[PDB]
Structure formats: C-alpha cells, structure tokens
Design a protein around this ligand. Structure first.
Ligand code: PH0
Ligand code: YB
Ligand code: ZN
Length: 610
C-alpha cells in the first residue's frame, strides 16, 4: 500500500533507511545551542541512489562529510512547521542495501521547538541552568538532521559534552563519563541505545541531577530538592513493571529509570526509552496519580516496540497504551476500578468531541495530517476513542483474558516494526479468525474514519462512579434553600479519585450559581487540596462559575507549572471570563519568553494573541 509520511520532507523508508546515529555534541548554555556532529549510517533501498533528503528545522549546517570529503548539500525553502529539507548529493551512487556513513556538522537554534533552556531561577536549586528536549512528534528535526518519521527505526550512540558541574542523561543506557579531552571544565557523558527506535524517542536532559535507587532496575532522577518526594511517589514502579511484563512480554530495554522534570515540562509523561520523563505535578504526596507511570511503562511495548508508521495512525500508540495502563491499574486495584477509569475516559471523549464539534476531522480515529501541525491536532481522541474501540472489542470477543492474549500476540508479531491501522486490523482478523462473524458486526468505517462519538458505547460497571454522580446531581439540582444541607461529611467515603470524578461531573454542567461554588468552598475547603488534578478541576469550576476570588489562584497555577493539560484550559477559562481576560492576556505576554516553545505557541493560539 502507498503510505507516505506527509509530516516528513525526508527521503522515505522505501528509498533509504537510517540504521544508526552516532551523535557527538556539546551543550552551550551561554549561547543556548547544541553543537556538533550527527553521523548517520544509512542503507540504500534503491539501485543507483545518488541523493537523499533529510528533515531539518532551524538548524545551521556547517558541513557534510562522506568518505572523508565534503560533499554538496542544499537546504530547501522552509515549509512552515515541517522545517526545511536538506538534500545531500552522494559522492558515489549506491547499490541496493549498500550502507554509508554521512557525517553532518550542525548547530541548533536557541528557538528550537525541541528544546527548553531554563535559567537558574527557573530551577529548584537556583545555581545552575537546565536543558531538556521533547522530540515527539516531529521535533527531532529541530535538534539534528534526520529522517524524522516513525517509519524508520535506528540504534544510537552519543557523547555529550556539558559543564562539569552538570549531569547529562538520554533515552539510552549510561555508558561512562570522562573529563572532556578538549576542556577540563567539561565532562563528556556517553550513551548507548542498542534497541532500534524511531527518532521521536531520542531524548536529552542536562542539569544539576541526583538519583536515588527505587527498584532493582529503576533510579529516580531529579534536582536534589525533589528526590526524596519522587522516590516515595513512584515507589510502586517495580510492581507495575512486573504486571506490565506479564501483560506484554519481556521488558527489552534494560533499565527503567524516571526523571522528574522542572515544572514547565509540557506533558504528564513521555515514554523515552530507558528514561521516562514525568511532570512534577505528579508529586501529590499519596501516589494517587500513579496511572501516569502505568501509562509510560505500557509504552515500552505499545509505542516503543510496536510503533505507528505515520502520525495518522497515532491512535495505535495511544489506544493500546491506555488499554494496557487500565489493566495494570485493574490488577492493582480491582476490576471495578478499571471500569471506573474506563467510564471516566468516555466522559473525557465526550468533552473532546463537544469541544471540537461532532463532525470535526480531528475527532476521527485515523486522521489525515497533511498540512496539519501534529501539536495543533493533539487531543484525547486517539486515547479514548482508541481505548473505547479496544474495550468494545474485548466485550465482543469474550472478555479481558481473551483480549489480553491478542494484545501479547500483537506485540510479539510487530515488535521492532512500524505499522498502520490496516496491519492492526489484518492481524486482529488473523488472531480471531474463529470469531470473524463477530468482527464483521463491527462498523469499521464509523469507528476508524467517521468523526464524532463512536457508534456504540461499551458496557461499564458503575459501582465506584455512582457516589460521584449522586453528589454531583445534588449540587446541580440544589436551590439556595438546599445549600445548608451540604457538609464536609459528604466527602468521607470518597477516594481522591472519586473526589476528582465528582468535580469532573460537576464541571461538565458548569457554570453553577456563584452561591453554590462559595458554599462548596465553605464546606469542602477545596482551596486547600494540593493534588494538581483536583485543584485544576476545582479552579476551572470556580472560574467558569465567575468567582473573582479564584482569578489569582487560577493565574498562579497556570503560570507556576506548564503541564499543557492544566495551563491551556486555565488560560482559556481566564480569557473567557470578562473579569480576568485582560489579566490572562497580559500574564501570557509576560511569561511567554520563558515558557516551553510548544506550550507558548498553543496558548497563544488559544488566546488569539501575537
Ligand atoms: N507519547 C506522549 C504523547 C505525546 C507527546 C508529544 C507529542 C505527541 C504525543 P504520552 O506518554 O501519551 C503523554 C500523555 C501521558 C498520559 C496520557 C493518559 C493518561 C496518563 C498519562 C499525557 O501527558 N497527556 C496529558 C493529558 C492528555 C491526555 C490525552 C490527550 C491529551 C492530553 C497529561 O497527562 O498531561
Ligand atoms: Yb426548596
Ligand atoms: Zn501515551
């Protein structure tokens, strides 16, 4: 089938394939640049190959060397968020399967969309600066020239020169450290990734990092001030990894370390191989937000081993990971708990479809991302519509034990490969060939290609959800004369997850009367809850219900951390409230330069500014 990666301007995998990258670079904090060489080992997939094209974005190319000599290259015109193509003229034509090494000298821009450079004042320690990357989806080309498409998988080695007071880490096994032979104020850290990965999984952090061991194959890394809290927060990681291995097969990556980033990290987690990145907004104090780690761990099979061939097929990465994530939680906390989370995920799917509109092309499972920035299209849809389809199939095909056997087999079949929705579907029909009649009842075209809510809602146990719905409806249907009957005892039999779901339910019906929201603070004292998910929902409820007192609390949360799940809707809610609109816009303008590049772009679009 003719599948191209419409988000890449590089030569496709049918023309040539990168096999290995050897990255030698130096991190320059005074200039905010990464400098050095990327040597790509490339295999021709064609006869008489004489040129190839690489993805770049805001990179300065000094030179390209093949067989010890400089070769001609040309940078094409920028194609907005896709960057500029780099055509390289090979010095000798290559036969099919012939491999050569191309060494490219380059330097990044300070405005690389892959990178956030943090001043010492943006860190916990306040002495040293800090750098972290975020390559997914198509930002690797903003760090190094590459075939920036998940259809191509490579191994890599790297040597990273950094100020000696600082530590470098990568999505790779640590392979030693030395003083820098060309500067005794610098150290070189070395890295090896022996399992082939798509380039979106290359990751780098440089900062004042310490580690603590928390399991036989896990260290947690953060600035010194966060280490003790992180070790406790994530102490269940080894248990979860064991359950994940039971579901998916051997963990093949060696180490499973965790890095807790500074507050501007845009995501809850990122599944960088060997080194999952996490937001410090997870540090609730009671391990209640551990589903993020379950999700990242699950990507070590679905995403990192079996990878989407192009971003149009992103739901294969996320839907299966959610499905695995919810099984880990179900093993740990019971099947009624898995149904609670699944039911919550349907509510999130309703929110996202309501927000985009029920005919919008982004609510489709398989999307067409030609001339669409993946960062713009990013939503809960591939997560929850993908999970729903899997949960529906589970129920159709005979239950969780049966469907988990399909999942283990799917992972074995496609490990180390990149696949499309049609590969998945073909294998699903192969695996369940004795149930094809059942499969043929599925409305494939609706599920995979039609926008809006799915054509069929799965069955959900409601047991843990009922108390949330009941309390939410009491508040929604309350009149002024009913407010007196609410009391802090209403909350006594609710877990933190149930409190979150109470606020989610109520938020879906927002605004509530201002008197209701004030009563809620009076009796539940939600302003005191530090848990970031609960606090985020409470603040949105307060702002959407037009409570002015909440304006400074909402602005503070929106700006003191940068997790987009929180910062984007808080800014949007503050902009839609007339009392805070000017302050929202002004606060964005003031903070923008020190925000993450991607977060700044999206919040900017959300507010209709710059
Ligand atoms: N590959 C990572 C996703 C990614 C990063 C960069 C470019 C493309 C794709 P990823 O590992 O699933 C991150 C996920 C991790 C996650 C998802 C669901 C449950 C738990 C964890 C997460 O961070 N999503 C947000 C909230 C959110 C969920 C779903 C849709 C939109 C927003 C958050 O939690 O801030
Ligand atoms: Yb009444
Ligand atoms: Zn994910």
């Amino acid at each position: 089938p003719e599948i191209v990666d419409t988000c890449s301007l590089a030569s496709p995998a049918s023309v040539c394939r990168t096999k290995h990258l050897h990255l030698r670079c130096s991190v320059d904090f005074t200039r905010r640049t990464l400098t050095g060489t990327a040597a790509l080992t490339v295999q021709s997939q064609e006869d008489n190959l004489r040129s190839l094209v690489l993805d770049t974005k805001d990179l300065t190319i000094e030179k390209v060397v093949i067989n010890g000599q400089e070769v001609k290259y040309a940078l094409g015109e920028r194609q907005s968020y896709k960057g500029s193509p780099m055509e390289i003229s090979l010095p000798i034509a290559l036969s099919k399967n012939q491999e050569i090494v191309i060494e490219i000298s380059f330097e990044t821009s300070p405005k690389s969309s892959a990178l956030q450079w943090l001043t010492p004042e943006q860190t916990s320690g306040k002495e040293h600066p800090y750098l972290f990357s975020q390559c997914q989806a198509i930002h690797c080309r903003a760090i190094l020239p590459c075939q920036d498409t998940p259809s191509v998988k490579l191994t890599y080695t790297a040597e990273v020169s950094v100020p000696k007071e600082l530590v470098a880490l990568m999505s790779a096994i640590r392979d030693g450290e030395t003083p820098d032979p060309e500067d005794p104020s610098r150290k070189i850290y070395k890295f090896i990734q022996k399992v082939p990965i798509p380039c979106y999984l290359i990751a780098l952090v440089v900062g004042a990092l310490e580690s603590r061991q928390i399991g036989p194959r896990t260290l947690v890394w953060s600035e010194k001030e966060q280490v003790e809290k992180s070790a406790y927060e994530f102490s269940e990681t080894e248990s979860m990894l064991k359950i994940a291995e039971d579901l998916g097969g051997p963990y093949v990556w060696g180490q499973y370390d965790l890095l807790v980033l500074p507050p501007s990290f845009p995501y809850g987690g990122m599944e960088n191989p060997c080194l999952t990145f996490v937001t410090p907004t997870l540090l609730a104090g009671d391990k209640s937000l551990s589903n993020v780690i379950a999700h990242e761990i699950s990507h070590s099979w679905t995403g990192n081993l079996v990878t989407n061939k192009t971003w149009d097929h992103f739901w294969l990465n996320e839907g299966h990971t959610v499905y695995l994530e919810r099984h880990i939680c179900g093993r740990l906390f019971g099947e009624k708990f898995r149904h609670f989370n699944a039911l919550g995920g349907w509510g999130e799917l309703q929110n996202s479809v309501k927000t985009f509109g029920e005919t919008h092309p982004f609510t489709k499972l398989v999307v067409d991302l030609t001339d669409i920035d993946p960062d713009v299209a990013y939503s809960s849809v591939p997560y929850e519509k993908g999970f729903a389809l899997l949960f529906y199939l589970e129920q159709l095909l005979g239950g969780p034990e049966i469907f988990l056997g399909f999942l283990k087999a799917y992972v074995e079949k496609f490990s180390y490969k990149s696949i499309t929705t049609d590969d998945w579907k073909d294998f699903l029909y192969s695996y369940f060939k004795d149930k094809v009649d059942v499969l043929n009842q599925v409305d494939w075209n609706a599920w995979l290609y039609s926008p809006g809510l799915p054509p069929i809602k799965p069955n959900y146990d409601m047991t843990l959800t009922n108390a949330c719905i009941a309390l939410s409806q009491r508040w929604i249907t309350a009149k002024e004369d009913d407010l007196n009957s609410f009391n802090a005892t209403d909350l006594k039999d609710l877990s933190s997850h149930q409190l979150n779901e109470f606020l989610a339910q109520t938020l879906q019906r927002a605004p509530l009367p201002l008197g209701h929201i004030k009563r809620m603070q009076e009796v539940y004292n939600f302003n005191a809850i530090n848990n970031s998910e609960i606090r985020f929902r409470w603040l949105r409820l307060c702002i959407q219900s037009k409570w002015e007192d909440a304006i400074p609390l909402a602005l503070k949360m929106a700006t003191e951390q940068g997790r987009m799940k929180f910062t984007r809707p808080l800014f949007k809610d503050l902009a839609a409230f007339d009392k805070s609109h000017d302050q929202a816009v002004r606060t964005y303008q003031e903070h923008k330069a020190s925000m993450h590049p991607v977060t700044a772009m999206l919040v900017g679009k959300d507010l209709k500014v710059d």
